[PDB]
């Protein structure tokens, strides 16, 4: 580790108090996993998310941070905007949406996680 830093915090769900962060130098450990019950990184045990709603993974090539919607039954809205669950019946995995500092995700009825991204001079 040692490059950049992303931090997230569950603001309203059946697990208020879960936070997720990682460095831009993390490879197979970076891709976060927000979900109800599973190997996911955030435990949002809300019926809205059968198992996993969404996650995050970014690129250091174009320095971009985007999240995806794994079977977005309820849907994952970024900054109050359904960016990856635009098609219900489709339940498509969706394409990675780029998140930003001060953003906000909602993968259910009220489960909303704060999106923060800060650097680190090491």
Swiss-Prot record:
Dephosphorylates the Ser/Thr receptor-like kinase RLK5. May function as a signaling component in a pathway involving RLK5. Binds and dephosphorylates CLAVATA1 (CLV1). Functions as a negative regulator of the CLV1 signaling in plant development. Dephosphorylates SERK1 receptor kinase on threonine residues in the A-loop. Dephosphorylation of SERK1 controls SERK1 internalization. Component of a signaling pathway which mediates adaptation to NaCl stress. Is not a component of the SALT OVERLY SENSITIVE (SOS) pathway. Residues 32-83 form the FHA domain. Disruption phenotype: No visible phenotype under normal growth conditions, but mutant seedlings show increased sensitivity of roots to salt stress. The chain holds residues 180 to 298 of 581 of the full protein. This is Protein phosphatase 2C 70. The gene is KAPP. Expressed in all tissues examined. It is found in: Cell membrane. Association of RLK5 with kapp domain is dependent on phosphorylation of RLK5 and can be abolished by dephosphorylation. Interacts with SERK1 and CDC48A. Component of the SERK1 signaling complex, composed of KAPP, CDC48A, GRF6 or GRF7, SERK1, SERK2, SERK3/BAK1 and BRI1. Interacts with CLV1.
